[PDB]
Paper text:
In the present study, we isolated and compared four nAbs from three rhesus macaques that were immunized with a group M consensus envelope called CON-S. Although, the macaques were immunized with different CON-S envelope vaccine regimens, the CON-S nAbs had immunogenetic commonalities, and were able to exchange immunoglobulin chains with each other and still maintain envelope reactivity. To investigate whether the antibody sequence similarity between DH840.1, and DH846.1 translated to similar variable fragment (Fv) conformation, we determined the crystal structures of unliganded DH840.1 and DH846.1 antigen binding fragments (Fabs) at resolutions of 2.7 Å and 2.8 Å, respectively. All four monoclonal antibodies neutralized CON-S, but lacked heterologous tier 1 or 2 neutralization. Overall, all four antibodies bound to Env gp120 where C3, V3, and fifth variable (V5) regions converged.
Antibody DH840.1 was recovered from one culture well that exhibited neutralization. Despite being isolated from different macaques vaccinated with different regimens, DH840 and DH846 antibody lineages were both inferred to derive from IGHV4-n and IGKV3-d heavy chain and light chain variable gene segments, respectively. In DH840.1 these amino acids were V29CDR1, R30CDR1, E91CDR3, and W94CDR3 in the light chain variable (VL) region (All antibody residue numbering and CDR loops are designated using the Kabat numbering system). Alanine substitution of W100bCDR3 in the heavy chain reduced antibody binding to CON-S by 64%. The reduction in Env gp120 binding by DH840.1 W100bA was more severe when the envelope glycans were modified to be high mannose glycans by kifunensine treatment or GnT1 knockout. Changing W94CDR3 in the VL also reduced binding activity in the presence of high mannose glycans but to a lesser extent. Thus, W94CDR3 and W100b CDR3 enabled DH840.1 to accommodate the presence of high mannose glycans on Env. In summary, one of the principal amino acids that conferred DH840.1 Env binding was a solvent-exposed, germline-encoded tryptophan at position 100b in the heavy chain CDR3. DH840.1 Fab approached the Env tilted more towards the trimer apex than the other three antibodies, but still contacted the same site on Env. The binding stoichiometry of CON-S neutralizing antibodies may be important for neutralization potency, since DH840.1 exhibited the lowest trimer occupancy and the lowest neutralization potency.
Numbering used by the authors:
A (entry chain H): 1 to 35, 35A, 36 to 52, 52A, 53 to 82, 82A, 82B, 82C, ...
B (entry chain L): 1 to 210
Write the structure that this text describes.
């Protein structure tokens, strides 16, 4: 009965200030016990950042980043924002905002999380991907795919036949190449007898670069 | 100063059996532990708060317990919908989560289907070609992929990626990409992908010319 939605830039230059806004829908923000920010670094679990309490406005933050983080609250917009300053590349993570509940004990726990927003910290520029088809060499099952090469930053969306084909599809997580750019594959297994009577297209979407490409695979 | 350590890192449980996850606090914290479930690409969902209280909507199969320093999350009759990462959280003003525990179901040994994809013709115009080898639907999580160009081993020039455990058949897929320059790709002939896996009696090799 409460929905949270993170907002902010997906790419931030180093040493700048990351500003993320958490829009709350369903209830008043001050009707909640407390609100918090938690991020998910690559190769790391959940790491709590800040927590603001409604009745007092008091803030608690992780000591390893105390002077670099603040939180503002706008009751008119029914939202609260997180501001991280002097941002380094260590701050690249998926940032969530969540509602806290103290139960009878008064100790906080999160009961409602937002979608989460990926923020990459890099001085690199936004780059669109190159999409190449993946077909076997020129046997009861064929493997078709698309290679989404050299894009920045994450993420990208890949669907097959405009979401009409889901079975046998495997979209692999992206791999960070040593060039600073990402590349992933998205494969699908189909009956070999259907290759002549069935078209297979991959729908690649890279919102950071405003790129959209559909590739016919044969 | 209080730390919460989870154990084990990965947990492999047969379908219908019991999964027992551990969360150890460095100091006695009574019942101030909350458990969360997080699936890949999704937000964390609250399972247990105050050590043993189920969140609304959480089935009776899952139940938390423990007081003091050691805490346990139990998943009885494990379901394919239970494959996720589970976090325990210390309920304090200075919050802190555990490292997380990945849970997967146990399956019969499944051999992988090995496919290899020659680079498209528009790749060579770019100056860089990428050949992809696909390992599709195998249960033993780890395999060994080897790239051989004219018999020369070239594994350190590739990158691999593994998808999550499938919700339907409970297998894993792997995709390796060997990235070379066009001026180096045109100077060699045979490009082979050698796969070693538990479900294979001998290594499987897929190759192509040109």
């Amino acid at each position: 009965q409460v929905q949270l939605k993170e907002s902010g830039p997906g790419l931030v230059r180093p040493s700048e200030t990351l500003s993320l806004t958490c829009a709350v829908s369903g209830t008043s923000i001050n009707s909640a016990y407390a609100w918090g920010w938690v991020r998910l670094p690559p190769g790391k679990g959940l790491e709590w950042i800040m927590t603001v309490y409604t009745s007092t406005g008091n803030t608690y933050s992780d000591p390893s980043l105390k002077s670099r983080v603040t939180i503002s609250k706008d009751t008119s917009k029914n939202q609260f924002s997180l501001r991280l300053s002097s941002v380094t590349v260590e701050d690249t993570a998926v940032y969530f905002c969540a509602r806290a509940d103290g139960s009878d004990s008064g100790w906080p726990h999160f009961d409602n999380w937002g979608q989460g927003l990926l923020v990459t910290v890099s001085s690199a520029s936004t780059k669109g991907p190159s999409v190449f088809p993946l077909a076997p060499s020129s046997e009861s099952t064929a493997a078709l795919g698309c290679l989404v090469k050299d894009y920045f930053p994450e993420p990208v969306t890949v669907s097959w036949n405009s979401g009409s084909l889901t079975s046998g599809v495997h979209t692999f997580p992206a791999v960070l190449q040593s060039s600073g750019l990402y590349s992933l594959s998205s494969v699908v297994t189909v009956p070999s007898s259907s290759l002549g009577t069935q078209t297979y297209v991959c729908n690649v979407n890279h919102k950071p670069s405003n790129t959209k490409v559909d590739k016919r695979v044969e | 100063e209080i730390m919460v350590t989870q154990s084990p890192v990965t947990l492999s449980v047969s379908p219908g059996e019991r999964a027992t996850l551990s969360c150890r606090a460095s100091q006695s914290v009574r019942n101030r532990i909350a458990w969360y479930q997080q699936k890949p690409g999704q937000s964390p969902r609250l399972l247990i708060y105050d050590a043993s209280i189920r969140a609304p909507g959480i089935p009776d199969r899952l139940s938390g317990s423990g007081s003091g320093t050691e805490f346990t999350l139990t998943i009885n009759s494990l379901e394919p919908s239970d494959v996720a990462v589970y976090f325990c959280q210390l309920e304090a003003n200075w919050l802190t989560f555990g490292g997380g525990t990945k849970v997967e179901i146990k399956r019969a040994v499944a051999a992988p289907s090995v496919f290899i994809f020659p680079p498209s013709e528009d790749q060579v115009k770019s100056g860089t070609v990428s050949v992809v080898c696909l390992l599709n639907n195998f249960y033993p999580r780890e395999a060994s992929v080897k790239w051989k160009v004219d018999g020369v081993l070239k594994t350190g020039n590739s990158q691999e990626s593994v998808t999550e455990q499938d919700s339907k058949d409970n297998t894993y897929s792997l995709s390796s990409t060997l990235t070379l320059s066009n001026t180096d790709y045109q100077s060699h002939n045979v490009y082979a992908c050698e796969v070693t896996h538990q479900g294979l009696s001998s290594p499987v090799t897929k190759s192509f010319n040109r």
